[PDB]
Write a protein that binds this DNA or RNA. Structure first.
Ligand SMILES: CC[C@H]1OC(=O)[C@H](C)[C@@H](O[C@H]2C[C@@](C)(OC)[C@@H](O)[C@H](C)O2)[C@H](C)[C@@H](O[C@@H]2O[C@H](C)C[C@H](N(C)C)[C@H]2O)[C@](C)(O)C[C@@H](C)[C@@H]2N[C@@H](COCCOC)O[C@H]([C@H]2C)[C@]1(C)O
Ligand SMILES: [Mg+2]
Ligand SMILES: [Mg+2]
Ligand SMILES: [Mg+2]
Ligand SMILES: [Mg+2]
Ligand SMILES: [Mg+2]
Ligand SMILES: [Mg+2]
Ligand SMILES: [Mg+2]
Ligand SMILES: [Mg+2]
Ligand SMILES: [Mg+2]
Ligand SMILES: [Mg+2]
Ligand SMILES: [Mg+2]
Ligand SMILES: [Mg+2]
Ligand SMILES: [Mg+2]
Ligand SMILES: [Mg+2]
Ligand SMILES: [Mg+2]
Ligand SMILES: [Mg+2]
Ligand SMILES: [Mg+2]
Ligand SMILES: [Mg+2]
Ligand SMILES: [Mg+2]
Ligand SMILES: [Mg+2]
Ligand SMILES: [Mg+2]
Ligand SMILES: [Mg+2]
Ligand SMILES: [Mg+2]
Ligand SMILES: [Mg+2]
Ligand SMILES: [Mg+2]
Ligand SMILES: [Mg+2]
Ligand SMILES: [Mg+2]
Ligand SMILES: [Mg+2]
Ligand SMILES: [Mg+2]
Ligand SMILES: [Mg+2]
Ligand SMILES: [Mg+2]
Ligand SMILES: [Mg+2]
Ligand SMILES: [Mg+2]
Ligand SMILES: [Mg+2]
Ligand SMILES: [Mg+2]
Ligand SMILES: [Mg+2]
Ligand SMILES: [Mg+2]
Ligand SMILES: [Mg+2]
Ligand SMILES: [Mg+2]
Ligand SMILES: [Mg+2]
Ligand SMILES: [Mg+2]
Lengths: 51, 76, 96, 64
RNA sequence: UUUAAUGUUUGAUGUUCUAACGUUGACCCGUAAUCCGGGUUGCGGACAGUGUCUGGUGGGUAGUUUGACUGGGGCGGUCUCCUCCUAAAGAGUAACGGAGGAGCACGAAGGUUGGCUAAUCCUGGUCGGACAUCAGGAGGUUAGUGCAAUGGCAUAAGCCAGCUUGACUGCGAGCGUGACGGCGCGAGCAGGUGCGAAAGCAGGUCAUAGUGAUCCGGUGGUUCUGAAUGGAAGGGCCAUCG
RNA sequence: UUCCUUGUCGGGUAAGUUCCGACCUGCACGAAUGGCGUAAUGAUGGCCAGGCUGUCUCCACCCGAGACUCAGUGAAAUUGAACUCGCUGUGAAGAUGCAGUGUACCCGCGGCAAGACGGAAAGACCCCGUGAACCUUUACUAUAGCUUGACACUGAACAUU
RNA sequence: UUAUUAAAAACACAGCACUGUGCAAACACGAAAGUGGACGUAUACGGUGUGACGCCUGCCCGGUGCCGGAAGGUUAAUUG
RNA sequence: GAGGACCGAACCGACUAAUGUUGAAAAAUUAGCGGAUGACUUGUGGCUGGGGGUGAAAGGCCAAUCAAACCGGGAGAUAG
RNA sequence: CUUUUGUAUAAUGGGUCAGCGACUUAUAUUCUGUAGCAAGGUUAACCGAAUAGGGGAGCCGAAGGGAAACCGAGUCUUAA
């Protein structure tokens, strides 16, 4: 019961976002991943933000 | 200490036995491990569910140097 | 709907959608109704006079249902592309 | 007196063409992060009421 | 630069004042009446008291709740989920039957490509010991698997490294399993992506536990709706949270 | 007030789980929800003795009122229907009614209560009902009352700032 | 004192203590007026516990309640 | 000539036993029993009203009625 | 008779007779039968020497899909 829920916001202008979990005690660094943005239909980079 | 717990039965086992005609995608056997292995025209799901990848009759065989049971679809 | 205490079906399922107030003032007209009108030219008033649509209807659409045989002049009504062909095939005329 | 519709049922079931009823799926209100996208995707479209439950729905929606 | 004091708005209280108000003080009259009212006067005096609003207190009073299973009830235990046995060689199958677990973890412990193969023991060897690292032989998985058990696992699903984000979006032939709500498996199609020379593989993790319907409400989005009209509010739809 | 417990010792009795005296090992006394004493009082609780006795050993007789018979009047609870025996077995598991068997001429009257799971009251015990009532409280939600402040009824002057 | 299964060791009691109450008293019955308390005034009245008399009545204010305190913290309507 | 003093009738009460228990009686009779100048008893009239009264307190009593009287109404309450 | 796994049961109910005594009514809705008409069917209130006739306001049906705008024998889903 330590992993907090986070959201990954797309770097594109669209407000689309994914949601996942994260252990903020062991991994304080922000999570950045390349995920598919269904609004622009491209693989852009997604950065972490608060749920 | 005290017993009295159990889990719901999972309805595993063979669903289509040898010689049965199946459509593509039909589940052949649900299993925990790979007690049966995928042969020709048979896929292995993420839970090791063997499903038919083509129409035809299912076929059980034991092959290989370890005498493992395989399931294949005789396409007809 | 009582199921002995188990959460009944109409409560364990979510509510969805909303009711449109514009759908209550919209009607559909079959091709077979175009001959019931008086005068040939059809509009909102002539359809209401012929007791084909309700008195509070503000929008009316003609659809490909039934069959039209006489030249009819549709005026101020939306017409489906299937009904538009059938009306023009019977010498009719469609004007916005 | 007229039969009164169960208003809660009217907001959850819509009558279809052949007399069936469509409804929204459950399990898609909250707690979706842990749910697989495949599972959530299969819950988006509307579904038909099963044969075993039509008796309950029809009794609650007499004017539907 | 600064400082004082006369003039002002609003509060913070107090010491006066009497004119509201109180008087279950005295006297007079209605009146041949310890009610009441009026008058005179004294004493209080903007307090007290009452109305509306408001915090506290409030079994004084009121309405109610206070589970089920159960070799009677109570007490104890139990209540959902996973694994094995009972279970009678398909599935399923009860008991307060026999044994154990779960209410997570992981941006690598996921994907892919390339490689790799244990436990234990023996022999020899600085400190070094029953047990560290080194070398050889035996052995052949008796090991390992994020965690219970079971079924699996060498083509390894076990171990290591490189590059990575498919832990993709829309779908989905066809099945499995449920009374139902549901739950599960899934080739293939479209879009876009990773790894690989390529065939290919990837829609999380060896599999099976790690979970909570609906309502109400929150946040973001939205070529939906907008009670005269244009907006807006609110609602819907999509994503997501409690 | 002591569970163990008829504690132990002493007194009383031929014999005393009670009683009286003591011991202290107070399961679990204790000082105004009072402690320990206490003359008098008590239709109060326990125990002992004298007297007295049909309380008893063990009942006997007697006098009256009923019971019994005759005349008059004349109820009640209860009641599926009855041509309404014993035993052993059986069986919704304790039989007048079933099986086997034994016994038994028909009908009263006075008696007695073993049975008819006798009569009486839809068990007070027990459990159950998402029954009820009343009671309790640091259960929940309220609320009368009590209390706080704001505003109103409610004004003037002046300090202090 | 349980009319009608309980008369008692229960209740009361004189006495004792604590506490409230300054009189338009506390308190009680009353939406209120009012009335009781009382035509009484702290040697009085109400409440509570104890229960003649005799000898006495020890320790604990942490908990709960009550009383006092007002500095600080928190905090309603109101204000905006 | 004092006393909630003593003995004991009326009077008030109700401790024991027997009887009665479809009674003579929906609480009595018989034989004994307690108080009997007092916190006594009794007549007539009055007052207190139902979540209320009254209670030397037993949840007692409030018209043979009481852990909330009786009568009418809600009312054909509801009764898995 | 009832109730039950099960009743001659010693489980319930009935002394007997006679009379009375329990699935109704209204309005909606669905299905079946039947009758009329039929891509149509039918009127309500009301008018009316009124069971006629008038009255078609309405209701149901002949089109659906979608939350909705909207489209429409298709539509929704999706960039497709
Ligand atoms: C004087 C006559 C009254 O009966 C009695 O007094 C009996 C002695 C009475 O029993 C007494 C004495 C007692 C020891 O039982 C012998 C005791 O246990 C019972 C509860 O009370 C009966 C048997 C007593 O019956 C016993 O009740 C108990 C609860 C169960 C017994 N049995 C079934 C085992 C049954 O025998 C009943 C209940 O009292 C009898 C009942 C039918 C009637 N009502 C009672 C009313 O007074 C008593 C208060 O009741 C609330 O009056 C009864 C009946 C009419 C009588 C017959 O009139
Ligand atoms: Mg019309
Ligand atoms: Mg949502
Ligand atoms: Mg209460
Ligand atoms: Mg109620
Ligand atoms: Mg129970
Ligand atoms: Mg099996
Ligand atoms: Mg692809
Ligand atoms: Mg490449
Ligand atoms: Mg695993
Ligand atoms: Mg508008
Ligand atoms: Mg003796
Ligand atoms: Mg003796
Ligand atoms: Mg002694
Ligand atoms: Mg004591
Ligand atoms: Mg005492
Ligand atoms: Mg004595
Ligand atoms: Mg006679
Ligand atoms: Mg027998
Ligand atoms: Mg015989
Ligand atoms: Mg009996
Ligand atoms: Mg009963
Ligand atoms: Mg009595
Ligand atoms: Mg008595
Ligand atoms: Mg003391
Ligand atoms: Mg204080
Ligand atoms: Mg005397
Ligand atoms: Mg005397
Ligand atoms: Mg006498
Ligand atoms: Mg005397
Ligand atoms: Mg009592
Ligand atoms: Mg009475
Ligand atoms: Mg009513
Ligand atoms: Mg009734
Ligand atoms: Mg029974
Ligand atoms: Mg049966
Ligand atoms: Mg039985
Ligand atoms: Mg029989
Ligand atoms: Mg019988
Ligand atoms: Mg019999
Ligand atoms: Mg019985
Ligand atoms: Mg009977």
């Amino acid at each position: 019961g330590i992993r907090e829920k986070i959201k990954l916001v797309s770097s594109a202008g669209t407000g689309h976002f994914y949601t996942t979990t994260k252990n903020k005690r062991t991994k304080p660094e922000k999570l950045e991943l390349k995920k598919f943005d269904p609004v622009v239909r491209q693989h852009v980079i997604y950065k972490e933000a608060k749920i | 200490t005290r017993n009295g717990r159990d889990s719901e039965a999972k309805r595993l086992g063979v669903k289509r036995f040898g010689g049965e005609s199946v459509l593509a995608g039909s589940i052949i056997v649900r299993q925990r491990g790979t007690k049966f292995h995928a042969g020709a025209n048979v896929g292995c799901g993420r839970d090791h569910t063997l499903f038919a990848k083509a129409d035809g009759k299912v076929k059980f065989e034991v092959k290989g140097p370890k005498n493992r049971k395989f399931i294949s679809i005789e396409a007809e | 709907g009582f199921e002995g205490g188990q959460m009944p079906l109409y409560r364990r399922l979510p509510k969805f959608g909303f009711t449109s107030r514009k759908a209550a003032i919209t009607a559909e007209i079959r091709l077979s109704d175009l001959a019931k009108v008086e005068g040939g030219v059809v509009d909102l008033n002539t359809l209401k006079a012929a007791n084909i649509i309700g008195i509070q209807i503000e929008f009316a659409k003609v659809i490909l249902a039934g069959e039209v045989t006489t030249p009819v002049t549709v005026r101020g009504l939306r017409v489906t592309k299937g009904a538009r062909a059938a009306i023009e095939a019977a010498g009719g005329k469609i004007e916005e | 007196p007229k039969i009164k519709t169960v208003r809660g049922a009217a907001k959850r079931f819509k009558k279809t063409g052949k007399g069936g009823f469509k409804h929204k799926h459950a399990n898609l209100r909250h707690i979706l992060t842990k749910k697989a996208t495949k599972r959530k995707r299969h819950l988006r479209p509307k579904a038909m009421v099963s044969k075993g439950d039509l008796g309950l729905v029809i009794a609650c929606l007499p004017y539907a």
